[PDB]
Structure 1
Amino acid sequence: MTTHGRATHYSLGQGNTIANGNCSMPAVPADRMYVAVSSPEYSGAAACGTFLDVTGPKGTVRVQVADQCHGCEVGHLNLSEEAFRALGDFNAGIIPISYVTVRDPAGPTVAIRVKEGSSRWWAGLQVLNAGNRIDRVEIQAGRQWLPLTRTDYGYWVTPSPIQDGPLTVKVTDQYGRAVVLPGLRMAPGEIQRTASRFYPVH
């Protein structure tokens, strides 16, 4: 539903090329529209990879949930400086806002990043461009599916070894929609683009 609250501002700067924010984004978004959310709204990183449409005095801006604001009460967003300025007066420090989690935000096809230190014995995966909350990430083991566990820093990790050769990953969103991503490589650090979408381009 709609949340009513307020915003402060902060910055990750240009950031780095490995992990940005508690959500470990591969990069600070090019448009610099991102946000840190309260611990309850962070929901153990379930909010990672999701977007908020935040309405303020001067308009509505779309921000990627990138980070956790431990000191933020529910309803209190810590907006990027760019998002803050798009909404109100920077020098005001705190502005009134309302926001919603975006349903099926426009974006590219799903991509997967294998975490540094991964191997067949134990691996982490980050799912990019799912658009909405992800509830399941699984790797194919023959006929079965091996369920990964959600970490609090934006990845999913394996509970036991996976087969050698290409990985087939199945991702299921909060709505029960699933994409199946075959031919993935055990290649730490690489952003592997796929041909899949949870929803078509509209």
Structure 2
Amino acid sequence: AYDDLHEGYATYTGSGYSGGAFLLDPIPSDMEITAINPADLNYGGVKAALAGSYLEVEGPKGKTTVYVTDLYPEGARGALDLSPNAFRKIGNMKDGKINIKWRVVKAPITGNFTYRIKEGSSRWWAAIQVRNHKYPVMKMEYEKDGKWINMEKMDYNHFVSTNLGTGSLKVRMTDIRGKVVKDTIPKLPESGTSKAYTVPGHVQFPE
């Protein structure tokens, strides 16, 4: 059915503010964040499906919302590793591990997607990340010669393809609800950029 909660346990950690597997840096220190177990992270057989999602997390002392910035490698199904500023709002940190119920919620954000084009990217091979997205990005495609080509999502929260073609890149993104939106990204470099770079986008998933 429509919007189920997930039972699990929360622990806490100070990692994930920097060097998180989803390459979402910089994370401001006042942000409530979490790492997420692999089974839940990879919903639908899509690697990093929940990367950059937001979760409402309910514990014994209340509820709070966290930004998913990292993998919780040894986490069981249902398990989250929150930042302590988030954890304290829903449980006593003396307890170390707490019972929780969580679910994906609409991101508390404004504006459009922002894209990050990974170092190494070119017309030959590219890795494109979506940031500032209101719901998990389950799918990304690009058009080439009138056909839409699926992009595999990677563990490091970018969508990848090869031989994408020349000129501007028409892309389309699908969320966890199945809503599809469409955008354009400027032509990829002749050859691999030494640095990742940012492209502010011009669409957002519907409310």
Please say whether Structure 1 and Structure 2 have the same fold, judged by a TM-score greater than 0.5.
yes
Alignment of 1:81-160 (within 5 A): 81-102=84-105, 104-108=106-110, 109-158=112-161, 160=162
AA of the residue aligned to 2:25: P
Give a deviation string over 1:28-74, Cα, whole Å, max 9, x none: 24532111122211113111121110012332111112222122212
Over 3 Å counting, the alpha-carbon distance change for 1:14 and 1:6 in structure 2 is closer
Pair 1:198-2:205 in alignment? yes
Q: What is the CA distance between 1:137 and its match in structure 2?
A: 0.9
Matched-pair identity in %: 30
Following TM superposition, where does structure 1 have runs of at least 4 consecutive aligned residues deviating by more than 4 angstroms? none
Deviates more, 1:175-184 or 1:79-88: 175-184
State TM-score, norm by structure 1.
0.86
In structure 2, the CA distance between the partners of 1:141 and 1:13, relative to structure 1 (3 Å rule), is: closer
1:92 match: secondary structure = coil
CA contact 1:34–1:80 (8 Å) conserved in 2: yes
Give the count of matched residue pairs.
194
C-alpha distance in structure 2 between counterparts of 1:150 and 1:49, whole Å: 13
Q: Distance in 2 between matches of 1:73 and 1:197?
A: 32
The offset of 1:80, in angstroms, is 1.0
Q: Does 1:73 align with 2:99?
A: no
Query: After the TM superposition, which of the residue ranges 188-197 and 80-89 deviates more from structure 2?
Result: 188-197
Please, which runs of 5 or more residues in structure 2 have no aligned partner?
A: 190-194
Describe the SS at the equivalent of 1:83: helix
Check the 8 A contact 1:50/1:133 in 2, yes or no. Answer: yes
The two structures have a TM-score, normalised by structure 2, of 0.84
Please state how far the C-alpha of 1:97 moved relative to its aligned partner: 1.8
**Residues 117 and 129 of structure 2 are in contact (CA less than 8 Å); yes or no, is this contact kept in structure 1?**
yes
Distance 1:191 1:59 in 2: 37
Aligned-partner Cα distance in 1 for 2:40–2:28: 21
**Structure 1: segments with no counterpart, 5+ residues:** none
Aligned-partner residue type, residue 197 of structure 1: Q
Identify the residue that residue 170 of structure 2 maps to in structure 1: 168
Deviations 1:81-110 (A, max 9, x none): 2111222222321222221111x3232311
